[PDB]
Coordinates of C-alpha atoms and ligand atoms in Angstrom, one line a residue:
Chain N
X1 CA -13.7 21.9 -35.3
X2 CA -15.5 19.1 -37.1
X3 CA -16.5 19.0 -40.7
X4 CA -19.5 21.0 -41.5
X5 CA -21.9 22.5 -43.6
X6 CA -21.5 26.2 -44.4
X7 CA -24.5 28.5 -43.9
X8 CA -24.3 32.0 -44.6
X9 CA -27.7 33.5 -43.3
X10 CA -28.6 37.4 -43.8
X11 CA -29.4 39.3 -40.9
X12 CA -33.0 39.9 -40.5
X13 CA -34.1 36.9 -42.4
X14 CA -35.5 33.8 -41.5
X15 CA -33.5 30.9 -41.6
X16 CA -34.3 26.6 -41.5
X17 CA -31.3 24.0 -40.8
X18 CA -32.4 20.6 -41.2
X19 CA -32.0 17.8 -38.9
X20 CA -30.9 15.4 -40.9
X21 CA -32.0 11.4 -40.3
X22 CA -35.1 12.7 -38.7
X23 CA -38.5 11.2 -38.7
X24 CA -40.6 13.4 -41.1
X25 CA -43.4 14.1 -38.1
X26 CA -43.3 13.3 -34.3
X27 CA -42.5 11.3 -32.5
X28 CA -38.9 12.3 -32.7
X29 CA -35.7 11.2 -30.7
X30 CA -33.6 14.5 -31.7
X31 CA -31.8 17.5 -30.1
X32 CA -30.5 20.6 -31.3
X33 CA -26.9 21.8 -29.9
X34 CA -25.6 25.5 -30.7
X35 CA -22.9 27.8 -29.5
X36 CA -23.3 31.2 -30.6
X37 CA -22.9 35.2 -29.9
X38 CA -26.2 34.1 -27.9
X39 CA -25.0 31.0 -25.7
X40 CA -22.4 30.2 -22.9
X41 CA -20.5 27.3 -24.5
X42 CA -23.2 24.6 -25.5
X43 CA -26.9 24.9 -26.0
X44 CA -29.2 22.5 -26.3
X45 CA -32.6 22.7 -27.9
X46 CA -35.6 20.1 -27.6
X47 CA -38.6 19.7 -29.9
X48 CA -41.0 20.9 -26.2
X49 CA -38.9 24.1 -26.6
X50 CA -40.0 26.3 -23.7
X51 CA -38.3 29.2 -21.9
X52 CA -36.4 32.2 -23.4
X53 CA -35.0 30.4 -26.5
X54 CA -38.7 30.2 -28.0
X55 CA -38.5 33.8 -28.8
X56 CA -35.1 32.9 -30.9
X57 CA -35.3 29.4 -32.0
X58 CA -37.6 26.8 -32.2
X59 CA -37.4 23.0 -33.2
X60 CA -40.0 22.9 -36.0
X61 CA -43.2 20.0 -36.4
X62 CA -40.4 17.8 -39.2
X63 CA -37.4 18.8 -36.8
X64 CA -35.7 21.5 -38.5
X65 CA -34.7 24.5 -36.1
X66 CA -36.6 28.1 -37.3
X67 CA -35.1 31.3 -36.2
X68 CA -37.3 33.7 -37.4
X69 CA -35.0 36.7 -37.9
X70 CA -31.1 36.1 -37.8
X71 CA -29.2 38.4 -35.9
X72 CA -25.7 39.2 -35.7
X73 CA -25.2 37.1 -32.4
X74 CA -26.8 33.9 -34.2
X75 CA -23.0 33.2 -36.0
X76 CA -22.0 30.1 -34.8
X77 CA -22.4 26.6 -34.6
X78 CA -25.8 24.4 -35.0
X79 CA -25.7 20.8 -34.7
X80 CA -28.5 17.9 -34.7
X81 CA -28.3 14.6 -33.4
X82 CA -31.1 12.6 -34.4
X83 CA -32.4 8.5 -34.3
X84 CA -34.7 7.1 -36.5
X85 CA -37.1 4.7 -36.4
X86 CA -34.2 2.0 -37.4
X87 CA -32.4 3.0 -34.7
X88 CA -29.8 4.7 -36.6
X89 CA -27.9 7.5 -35.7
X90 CA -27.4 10.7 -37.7
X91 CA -25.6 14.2 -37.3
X92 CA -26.0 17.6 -38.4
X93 CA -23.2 20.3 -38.6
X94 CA -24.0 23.5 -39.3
X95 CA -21.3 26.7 -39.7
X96 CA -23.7 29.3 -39.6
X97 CA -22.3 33.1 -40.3
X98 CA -24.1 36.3 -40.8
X99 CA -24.2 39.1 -42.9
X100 CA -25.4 42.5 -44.5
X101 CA -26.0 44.4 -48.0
X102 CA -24.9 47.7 -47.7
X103 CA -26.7 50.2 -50.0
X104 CA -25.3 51.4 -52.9
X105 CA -21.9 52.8 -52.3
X106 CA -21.8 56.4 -52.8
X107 CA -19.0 58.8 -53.9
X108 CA -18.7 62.2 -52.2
X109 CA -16.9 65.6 -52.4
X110 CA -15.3 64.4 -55.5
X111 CA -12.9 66.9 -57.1
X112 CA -13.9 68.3 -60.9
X113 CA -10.7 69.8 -60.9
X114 CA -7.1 67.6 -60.8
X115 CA -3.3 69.2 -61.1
X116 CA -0.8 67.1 -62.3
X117 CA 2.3 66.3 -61.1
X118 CA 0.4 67.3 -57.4
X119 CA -1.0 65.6 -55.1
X120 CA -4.6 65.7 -55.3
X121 CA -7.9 64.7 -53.0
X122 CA -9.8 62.9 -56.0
X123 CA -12.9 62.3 -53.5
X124 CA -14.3 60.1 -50.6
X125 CA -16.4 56.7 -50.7
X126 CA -18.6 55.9 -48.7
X127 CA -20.8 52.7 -48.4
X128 CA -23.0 52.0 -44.6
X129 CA -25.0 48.9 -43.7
X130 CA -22.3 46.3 -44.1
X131 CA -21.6 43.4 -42.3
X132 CA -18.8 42.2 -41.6
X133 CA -17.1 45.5 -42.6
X134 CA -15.9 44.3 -46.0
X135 CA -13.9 46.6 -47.9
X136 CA -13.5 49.6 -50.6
X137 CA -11.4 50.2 -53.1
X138 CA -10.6 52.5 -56.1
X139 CA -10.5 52.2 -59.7
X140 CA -9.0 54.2 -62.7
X141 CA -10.7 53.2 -66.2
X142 CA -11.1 49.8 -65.1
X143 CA -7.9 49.0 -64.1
X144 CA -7.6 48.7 -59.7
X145 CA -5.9 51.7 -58.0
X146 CA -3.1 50.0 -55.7
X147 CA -2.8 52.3 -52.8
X148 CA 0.9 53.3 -51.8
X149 CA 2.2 53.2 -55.7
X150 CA 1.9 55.0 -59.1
X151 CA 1.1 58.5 -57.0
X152 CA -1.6 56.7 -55.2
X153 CA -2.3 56.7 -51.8
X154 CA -5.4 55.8 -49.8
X155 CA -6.9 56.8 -46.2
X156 CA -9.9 54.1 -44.9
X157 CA -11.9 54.6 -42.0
X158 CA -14.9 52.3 -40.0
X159 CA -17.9 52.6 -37.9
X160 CA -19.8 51.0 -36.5
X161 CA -23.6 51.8 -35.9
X162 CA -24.1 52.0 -32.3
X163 CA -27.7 49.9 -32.2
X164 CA -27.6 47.9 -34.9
X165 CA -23.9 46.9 -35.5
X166 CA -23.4 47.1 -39.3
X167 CA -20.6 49.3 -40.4
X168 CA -19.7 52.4 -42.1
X169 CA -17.0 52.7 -44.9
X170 CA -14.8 55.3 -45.7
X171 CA -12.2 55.5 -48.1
X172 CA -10.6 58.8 -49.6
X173 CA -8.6 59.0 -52.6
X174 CA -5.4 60.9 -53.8
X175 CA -3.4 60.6 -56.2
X176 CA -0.7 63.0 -58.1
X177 CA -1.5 62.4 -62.0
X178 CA 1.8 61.9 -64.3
X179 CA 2.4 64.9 -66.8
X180 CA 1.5 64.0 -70.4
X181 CA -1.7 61.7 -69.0
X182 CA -5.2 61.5 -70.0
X183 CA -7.0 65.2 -69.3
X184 CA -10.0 63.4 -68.3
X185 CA -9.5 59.9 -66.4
X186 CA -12.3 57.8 -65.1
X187 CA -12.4 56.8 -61.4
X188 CA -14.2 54.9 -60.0
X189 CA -15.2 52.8 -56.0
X190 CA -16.4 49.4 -55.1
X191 CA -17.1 47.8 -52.5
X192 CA -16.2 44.5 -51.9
X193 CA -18.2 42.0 -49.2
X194 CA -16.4 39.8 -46.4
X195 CA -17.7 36.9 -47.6
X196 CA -16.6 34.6 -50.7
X197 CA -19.3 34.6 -54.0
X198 CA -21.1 37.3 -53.1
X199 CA -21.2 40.5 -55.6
X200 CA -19.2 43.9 -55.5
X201 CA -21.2 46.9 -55.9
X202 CA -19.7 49.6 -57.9
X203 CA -20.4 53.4 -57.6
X204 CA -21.3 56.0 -60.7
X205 CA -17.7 56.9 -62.4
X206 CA -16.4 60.4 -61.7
X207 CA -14.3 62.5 -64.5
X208 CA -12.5 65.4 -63.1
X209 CA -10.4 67.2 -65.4
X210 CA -6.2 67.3 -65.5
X211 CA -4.1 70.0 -66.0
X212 CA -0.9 69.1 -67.8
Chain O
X1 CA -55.9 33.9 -62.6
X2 CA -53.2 36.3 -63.0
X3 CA -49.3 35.6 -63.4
X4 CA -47.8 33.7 -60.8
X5 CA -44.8 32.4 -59.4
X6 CA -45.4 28.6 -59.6
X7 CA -44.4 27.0 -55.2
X8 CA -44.3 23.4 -54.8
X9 CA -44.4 22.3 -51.1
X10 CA -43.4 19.1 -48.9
X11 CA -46.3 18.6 -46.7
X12 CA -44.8 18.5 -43.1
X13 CA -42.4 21.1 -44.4
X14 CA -42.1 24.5 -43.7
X15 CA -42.5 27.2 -46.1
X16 CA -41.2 30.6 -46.5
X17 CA -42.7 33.3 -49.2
X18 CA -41.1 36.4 -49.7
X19 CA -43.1 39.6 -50.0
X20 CA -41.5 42.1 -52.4
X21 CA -40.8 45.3 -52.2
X22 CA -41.1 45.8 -48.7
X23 CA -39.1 47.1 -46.0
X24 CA -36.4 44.7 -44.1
X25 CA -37.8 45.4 -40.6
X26 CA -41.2 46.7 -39.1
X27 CA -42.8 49.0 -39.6
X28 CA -44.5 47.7 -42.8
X29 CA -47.3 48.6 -44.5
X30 CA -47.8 45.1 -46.4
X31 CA -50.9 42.3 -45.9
X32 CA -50.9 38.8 -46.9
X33 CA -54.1 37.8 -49.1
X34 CA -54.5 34.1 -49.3
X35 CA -57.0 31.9 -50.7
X36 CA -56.3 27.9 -50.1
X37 CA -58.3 25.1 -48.8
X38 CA -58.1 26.6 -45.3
X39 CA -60.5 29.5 -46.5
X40 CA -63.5 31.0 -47.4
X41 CA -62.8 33.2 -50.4
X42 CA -59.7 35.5 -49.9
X43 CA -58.4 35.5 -46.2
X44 CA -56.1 38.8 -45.3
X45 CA -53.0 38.3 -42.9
X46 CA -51.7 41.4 -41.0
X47 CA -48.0 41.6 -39.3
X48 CA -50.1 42.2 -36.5
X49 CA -51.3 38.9 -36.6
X50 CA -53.8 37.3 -34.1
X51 CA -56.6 34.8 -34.0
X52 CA -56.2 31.1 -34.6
X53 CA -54.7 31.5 -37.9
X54 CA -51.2 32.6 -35.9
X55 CA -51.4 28.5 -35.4
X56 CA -50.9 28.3 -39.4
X57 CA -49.4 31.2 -40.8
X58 CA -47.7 34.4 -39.2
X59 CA -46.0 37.3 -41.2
X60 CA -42.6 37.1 -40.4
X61 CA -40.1 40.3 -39.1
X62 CA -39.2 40.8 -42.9
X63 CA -42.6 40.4 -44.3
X64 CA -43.1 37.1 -45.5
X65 CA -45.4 34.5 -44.8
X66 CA -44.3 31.6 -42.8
X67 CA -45.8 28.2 -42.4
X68 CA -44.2 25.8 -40.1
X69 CA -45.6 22.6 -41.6
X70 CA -47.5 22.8 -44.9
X71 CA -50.6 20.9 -45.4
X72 CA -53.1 19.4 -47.8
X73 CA -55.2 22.2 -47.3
X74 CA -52.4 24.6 -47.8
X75 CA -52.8 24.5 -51.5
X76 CA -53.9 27.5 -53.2
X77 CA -52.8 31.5 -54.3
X78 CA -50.8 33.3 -51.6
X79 CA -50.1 37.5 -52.4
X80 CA -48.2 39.7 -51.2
X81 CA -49.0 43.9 -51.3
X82 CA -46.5 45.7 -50.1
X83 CA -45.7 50.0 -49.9
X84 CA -42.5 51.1 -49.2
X85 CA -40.5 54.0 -48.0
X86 CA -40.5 55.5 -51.3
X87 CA -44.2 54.7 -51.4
X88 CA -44.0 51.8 -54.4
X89 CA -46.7 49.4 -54.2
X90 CA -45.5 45.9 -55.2
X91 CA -47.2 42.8 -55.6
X92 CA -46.4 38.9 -55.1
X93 CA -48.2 35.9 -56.1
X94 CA -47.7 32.6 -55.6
X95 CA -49.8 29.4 -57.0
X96 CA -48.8 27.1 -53.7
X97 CA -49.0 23.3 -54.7
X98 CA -48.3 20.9 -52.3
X99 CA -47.2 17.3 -52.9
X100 CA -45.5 14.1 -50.7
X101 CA -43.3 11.5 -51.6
X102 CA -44.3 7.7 -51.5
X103 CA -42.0 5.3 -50.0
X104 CA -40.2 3.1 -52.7
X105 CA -42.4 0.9 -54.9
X106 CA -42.7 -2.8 -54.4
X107 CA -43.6 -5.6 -56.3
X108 CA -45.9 -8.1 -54.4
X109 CA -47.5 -11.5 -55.0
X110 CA -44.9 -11.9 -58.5
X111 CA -45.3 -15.3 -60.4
X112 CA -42.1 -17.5 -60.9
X113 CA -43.6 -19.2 -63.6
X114 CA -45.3 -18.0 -66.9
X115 CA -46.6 -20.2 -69.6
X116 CA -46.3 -18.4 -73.4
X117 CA -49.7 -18.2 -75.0
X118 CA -51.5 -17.8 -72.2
X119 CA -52.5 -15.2 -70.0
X120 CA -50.2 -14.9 -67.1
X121 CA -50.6 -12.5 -63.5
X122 CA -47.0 -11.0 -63.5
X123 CA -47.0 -9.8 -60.1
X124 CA -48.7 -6.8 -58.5
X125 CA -47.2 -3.3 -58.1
X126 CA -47.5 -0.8 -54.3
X127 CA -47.1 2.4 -53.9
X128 CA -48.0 4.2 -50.6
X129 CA -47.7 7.6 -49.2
X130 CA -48.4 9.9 -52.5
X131 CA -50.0 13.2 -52.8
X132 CA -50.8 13.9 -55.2
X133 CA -52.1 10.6 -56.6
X134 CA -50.1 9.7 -59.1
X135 CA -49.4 6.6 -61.0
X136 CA -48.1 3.2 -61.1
X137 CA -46.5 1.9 -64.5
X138 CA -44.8 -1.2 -65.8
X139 CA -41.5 -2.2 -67.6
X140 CA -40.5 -5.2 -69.7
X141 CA -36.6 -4.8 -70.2
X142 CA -36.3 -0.8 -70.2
X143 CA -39.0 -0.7 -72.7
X144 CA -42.5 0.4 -70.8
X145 CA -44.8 -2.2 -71.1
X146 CA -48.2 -0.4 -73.3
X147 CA -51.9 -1.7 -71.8
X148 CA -54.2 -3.1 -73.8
X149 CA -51.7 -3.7 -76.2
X150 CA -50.0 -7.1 -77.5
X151 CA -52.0 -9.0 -74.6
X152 CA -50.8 -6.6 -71.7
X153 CA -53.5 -5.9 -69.7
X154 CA -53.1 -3.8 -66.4
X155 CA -55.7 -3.3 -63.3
X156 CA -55.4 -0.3 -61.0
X157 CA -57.0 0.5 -57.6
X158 CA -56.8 4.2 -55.6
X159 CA -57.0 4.1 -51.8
X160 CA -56.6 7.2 -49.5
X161 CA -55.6 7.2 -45.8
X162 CA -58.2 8.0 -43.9
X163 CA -56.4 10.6 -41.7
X164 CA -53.4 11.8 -43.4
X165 CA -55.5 11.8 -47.0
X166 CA -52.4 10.4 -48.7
X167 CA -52.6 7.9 -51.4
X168 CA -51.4 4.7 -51.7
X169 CA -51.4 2.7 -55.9
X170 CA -51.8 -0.7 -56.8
X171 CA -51.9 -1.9 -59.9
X172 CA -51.7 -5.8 -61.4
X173 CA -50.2 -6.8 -64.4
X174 CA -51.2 -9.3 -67.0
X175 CA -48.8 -11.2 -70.0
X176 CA -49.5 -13.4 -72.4
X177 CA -45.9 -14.1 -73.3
X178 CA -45.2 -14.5 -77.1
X179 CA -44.0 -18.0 -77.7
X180 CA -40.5 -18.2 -79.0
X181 CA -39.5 -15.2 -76.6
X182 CA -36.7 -14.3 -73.9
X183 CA -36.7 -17.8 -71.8
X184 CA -35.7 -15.2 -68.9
X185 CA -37.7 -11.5 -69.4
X186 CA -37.1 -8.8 -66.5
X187 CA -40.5 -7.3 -65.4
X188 CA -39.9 -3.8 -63.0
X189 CA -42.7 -1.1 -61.7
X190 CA -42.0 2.8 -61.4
X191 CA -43.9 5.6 -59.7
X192 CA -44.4 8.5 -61.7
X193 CA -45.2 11.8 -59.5
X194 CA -48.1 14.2 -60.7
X195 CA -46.0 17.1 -59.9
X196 CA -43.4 17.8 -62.9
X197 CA -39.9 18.1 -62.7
X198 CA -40.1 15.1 -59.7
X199 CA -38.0 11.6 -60.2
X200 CA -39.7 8.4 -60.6
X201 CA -38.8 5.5 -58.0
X202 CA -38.6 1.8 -60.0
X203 CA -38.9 -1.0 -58.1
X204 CA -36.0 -4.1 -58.0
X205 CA -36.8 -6.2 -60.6
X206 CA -38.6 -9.9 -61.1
X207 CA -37.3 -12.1 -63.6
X208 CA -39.7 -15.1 -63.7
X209 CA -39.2 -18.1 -66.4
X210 CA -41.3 -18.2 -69.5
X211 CA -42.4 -21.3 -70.9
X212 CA -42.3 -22.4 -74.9
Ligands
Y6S301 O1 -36.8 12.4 -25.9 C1 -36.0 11.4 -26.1 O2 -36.4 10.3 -25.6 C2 -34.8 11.5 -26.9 C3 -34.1 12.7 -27.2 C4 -33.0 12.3 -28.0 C5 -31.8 13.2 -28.6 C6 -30.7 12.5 -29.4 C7 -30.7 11.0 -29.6 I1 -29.3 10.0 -30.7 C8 -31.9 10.2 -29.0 C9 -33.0 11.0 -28.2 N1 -34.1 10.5 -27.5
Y6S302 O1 -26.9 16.0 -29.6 C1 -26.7 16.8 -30.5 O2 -27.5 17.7 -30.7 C2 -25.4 16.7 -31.3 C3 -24.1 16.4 -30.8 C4 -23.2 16.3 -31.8 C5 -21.7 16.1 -31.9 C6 -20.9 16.1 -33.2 C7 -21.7 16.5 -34.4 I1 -20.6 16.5 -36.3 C8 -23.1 16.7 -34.4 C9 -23.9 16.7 -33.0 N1 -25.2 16.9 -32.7
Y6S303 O1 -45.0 37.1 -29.0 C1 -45.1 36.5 -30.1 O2 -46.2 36.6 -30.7 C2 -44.0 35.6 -30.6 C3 -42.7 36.0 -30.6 C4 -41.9 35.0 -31.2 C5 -40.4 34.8 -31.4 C6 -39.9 33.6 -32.1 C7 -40.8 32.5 -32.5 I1 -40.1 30.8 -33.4 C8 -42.3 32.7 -32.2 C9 -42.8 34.0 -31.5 N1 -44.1 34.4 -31.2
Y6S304 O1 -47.8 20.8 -34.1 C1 -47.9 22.1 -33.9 O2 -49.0 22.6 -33.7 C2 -46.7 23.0 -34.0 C3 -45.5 22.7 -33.3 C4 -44.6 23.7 -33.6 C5 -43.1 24.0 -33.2 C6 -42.4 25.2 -33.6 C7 -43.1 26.2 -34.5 I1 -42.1 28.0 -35.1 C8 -44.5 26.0 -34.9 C9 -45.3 24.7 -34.4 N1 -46.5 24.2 -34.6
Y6S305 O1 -53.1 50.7 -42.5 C1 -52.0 50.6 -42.9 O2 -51.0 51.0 -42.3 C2 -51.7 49.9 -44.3 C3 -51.7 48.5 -44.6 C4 -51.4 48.3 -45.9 C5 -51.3 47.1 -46.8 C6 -50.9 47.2 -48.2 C7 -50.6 48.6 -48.8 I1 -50.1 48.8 -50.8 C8 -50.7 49.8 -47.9 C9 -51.1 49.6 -46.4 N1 -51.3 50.5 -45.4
Y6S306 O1 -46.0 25.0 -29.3 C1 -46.3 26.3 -29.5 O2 -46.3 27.0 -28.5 C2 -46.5 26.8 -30.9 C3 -47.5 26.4 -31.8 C4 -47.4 27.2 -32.9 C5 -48.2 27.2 -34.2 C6 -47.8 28.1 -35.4 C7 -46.6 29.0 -35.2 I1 -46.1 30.4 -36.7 C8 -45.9 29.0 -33.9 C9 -46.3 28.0 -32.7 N1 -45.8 27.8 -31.5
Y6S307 O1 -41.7 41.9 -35.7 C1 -42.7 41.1 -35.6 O2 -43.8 41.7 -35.5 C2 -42.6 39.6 -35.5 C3 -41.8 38.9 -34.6 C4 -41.9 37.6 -34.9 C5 -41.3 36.3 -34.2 C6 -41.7 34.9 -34.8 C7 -42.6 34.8 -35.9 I1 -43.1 32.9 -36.6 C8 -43.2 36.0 -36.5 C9 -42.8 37.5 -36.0 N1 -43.2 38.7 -36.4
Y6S308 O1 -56.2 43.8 -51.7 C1 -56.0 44.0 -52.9 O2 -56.7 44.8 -53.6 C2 -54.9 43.2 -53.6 C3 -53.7 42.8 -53.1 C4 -53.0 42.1 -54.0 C5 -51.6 41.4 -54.0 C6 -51.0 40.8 -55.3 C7 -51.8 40.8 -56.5 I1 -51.1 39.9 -58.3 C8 -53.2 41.4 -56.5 C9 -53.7 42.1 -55.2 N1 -54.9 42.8 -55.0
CL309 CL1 -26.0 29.4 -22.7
CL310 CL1 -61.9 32.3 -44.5

C-alpha cells in the first residue's frame, strides 16, 4: 500500500491514532477510513459516530479515533483525512497490528538423566498466550541449539485457543550427547515474539546429568 | 502527599492511566479514587461505572481510567487500588497537571525609530492561549534583556478567556539605548511555559535604528 505509520497495539488495551491536521476542538471537517478483521473493504468513521461501530471505535472530542480494547480483528489499516481551518488538507496512515505476552515459558517433563552417544528426550517447552504464534527455541550453555545438526533434533507443535485466539507452543527437545562431553550441560528455552523489538523470554535452565 | 508519578496533560486531549497490578480483563476487583477540581474531597470510580461522571471518566476493560478530553478542572491526584488473582494489593498514583500551548508569540505596535539617551517603547510582546499562565520575556541580540536594569524597563498585563479560562500575556518593553551602541540592535520576545521540560516559542525579530 501507501506509506504509513506503524502501530503495534496489544490486545486488550486501549489504543488513540491521531488525526493529524485537525482542528484541536470542533468544528471539524475530518473522517476516519479503516479496513480491518472487522470491515468489508473500506470503513468510514464520522465524528456523530452512531450505529454498531460506537461499541468499537469512536472519533474522539480533538479527532483522534479511541478503541477502547484492541482485539485481534482490529489489525489493519486506519487512515484520517482531515481540513483545517486554512483549508489545507492532511492525511493520516496508520498500519495497525496486534499482539500478545505469553506468560513465562515453562519447561516440562525434563529428563535428570541423559545417555550419551543415544538419542535422548531432553524435555518439552511450553509457552501459551501468544499472539501471533511466535516461536521457541533451545539453548545449550548459551550457545543456540540448531535443530537437524550436532545430534539435535526438534519437534514443534501449535494451538490455538478456541475463544480467545492466542496460541499454544510446543517444542520438545532431543539430542544424542558426544562421548567425552560435559557430564552436566545446561539447557535452556526461549521464546521468541512475532514482532521486531520486542523481548524474548527465557525459561529456568535444566541440568540433567551424562553418562559417558 | 504521598509519592507520585508526575502526568502532564493537553487539555482537549485524551488521557489514559494505567492501574497496576490488576488483571487484563474483567472481572476486577480495582476502584479509581480521584480528587481534582471536579470534586468534593476524594471521588471513587467503579468498572461498573454509572451516573454523570461516565460523561468524564470511565474505567476502561483493562482497568485504567480514561478521559476523552482533559480539562482545567481535571487537575489533581488520580489512584489506582487494585487486587489480583494472587490476591496482591497494588497501588497507583498520579499528580495529573494539565497545561495548553499558546499560539506563537508576536510582536505588536514595534518602533522603527529609537533615539539613544532616551527612553524609547520597543514594541509590545502577545501571547494567547496559555494555561498555565506563564510568561513573556525579552531579548537584545541572544542575550535576555534584565528589567529594571541598565534603563530596561518592562510592563506586563494577565487576561483570561472568559469561557475557555486560558490566558493570553502582554508585556511592553522600554530602552533607553546607550549612546555610542549597535546603529542596528535586534530586539525578539519568547514564551516561557510554567510546565518544565516544555520549549519556549520566540517571536521573529525587530530591528529598529538607534540614534547617536
Ligand atoms: O462534515 C463535513 O462537512 C466534512 C467531512 C469531511 C471529511 C474529509 C474532508 I478533506 C472534509 C470534510 N468535511
Ligand atoms: O477520507 C479519509 O479518511 C482518508 C482517505 C485517505 C487516502 C490516502 C491516505 I495516505 C489517507 C486517507 N484518509
Ligand atoms: O454500554 C456501554 O456502557 C458502553 C460500551 C461501549 C464500547 C465502546 C465505547 I468508545 C463506549 C461504550 N459504552
Ligand atoms: O463532547 C463530548 O461530550 C464528547 C464527545 C465524545 C466522542 C467520543 C468519546 I469515547 C467521548 C466524547 N465526549
Ligand atoms: O467489592 C469488591 O468486589 C471489591 C472492590 C475492590 C477495590 C480495591 C480492592 I484492594 C479490593 C476490592 N474488592
Ligand atoms: O456522544 C456520546 O454518545 C458520548 C458522550 C460521551 C462522554 C464520555 C465518554 I468515556 C463516552 C461518550 N459518548
Ligand atoms: O468491560 C467493561 O466493563 C467496559 C467496556 C467498556 C467500553 C468503552 C469504555 I470508554 C469503557 C468500558 N468498560
Ligand atoms: O481507599 C483507600 O483506602 C485507598 C486507595 C488507594 C490507592 C493508591 C494510594 I498511594 C492510596 C490508597 N488508599
Ligand atoms: Cl464493513
Ligand atoms: Cl465529589
Amino acid at each position: 500500500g501507501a506509506m504509513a505509520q506503524n502501530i503495534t497495539a496489544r490486545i486488550g488495551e486501549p489504543l488513540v491514532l491521531k488525526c493529524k491536521g485537525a482542528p484541536k476542538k470542533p468544528p471539524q471537517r475530518l473522517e476516519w477510513k479503516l479496513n480491518t478483521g472487522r470491515t468489508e473493504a473500506w470503513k468510514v468513521l464520522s465524528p456523530q459516530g452512531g450505529g454498531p461501530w460506537d461499541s468499537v471505535a469512536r472519533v474522539l472530542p480533538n479527532g483522534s479515533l479511541f478503541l477502547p480494547a484492541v482485539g485481534i480483528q482490529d489489525e489493519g489499516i486506519f487512515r484520517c483525512q482531515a481540513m483545517n481551518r486554512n483549508g489545507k488538507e492532511t492525511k493520516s496512515n496508520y498500519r495497525v497490528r496486534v499482539y500478545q505476552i505469553p506468560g513465562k515459558p515453562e519447561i516440562v517433563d525434563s529428563a535428570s538423566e541423559l545417555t550419551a552417544g543415544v538419542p535422548n528426550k531432553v524435555g518439552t517447552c511450553v509457552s501459551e498466550g501468544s499472539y501471533p504464534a511466535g516461536t521457541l527455541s533451545w539453548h545449550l550453555d548459551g550457545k543456540p541449539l540448531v535443530p537437524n545438526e550436532k545430534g539435535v533434533s526438534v519437534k514443534e507443535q501449535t494451538r490455538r485457543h478456541p475463544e480467545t485466539g492466542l496460541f499454544t507452543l510446543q517444542s520438545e527437545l532431543m539430542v544424542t550427547p558426544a562421548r567425552g562431553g560435559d557430564p552436566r550441560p545446561t539447557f535452556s528455552c526461549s521464546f521468541s515474539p512475532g514482532l521486531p523489538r520486542h523481548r524474548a523470554l527465557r525459561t529456568a535452565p535444566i541440568q540433567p546429568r551424562v553418562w559417558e
